[PDB]
């Protein structure tokens, strides 16, 4: 009901990283969750005020 | 994973009032939670419109 109809921003819910969106799989008793994260690459250092 | 990596936005979930920080603490057998809340303190009465 969250991830899949809508987008979730309970943190670590939906898979690891931001949350973006999920789809469903069948599976014989049992569900399959494909969860479609976002996650930052390349960091830089920088001076702030 | 809710209220220590993150801001949670449930309502009485991470403690009374609003919710700003956690801190884990261990225990024999057992987690302790440090929750940080924030409370309004004073009222004042106003007209509206």
Redesign the interface.
């Known amino acids: 009901s969250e991830c899949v109809l809508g987008q979730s ?5 939906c898979g690891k990283g931001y949350h973006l969106m999920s789809f469903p799989q069948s599976a014989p008793h049992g569900v399959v969750f494909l969860h479609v994260t976002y996650v930052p690459a390349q960091e830089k250092n920088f001076t702030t005020a």
Chains 1, 2 share one sequence.
């Open positions: 921003k309970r943190v670590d819910f």
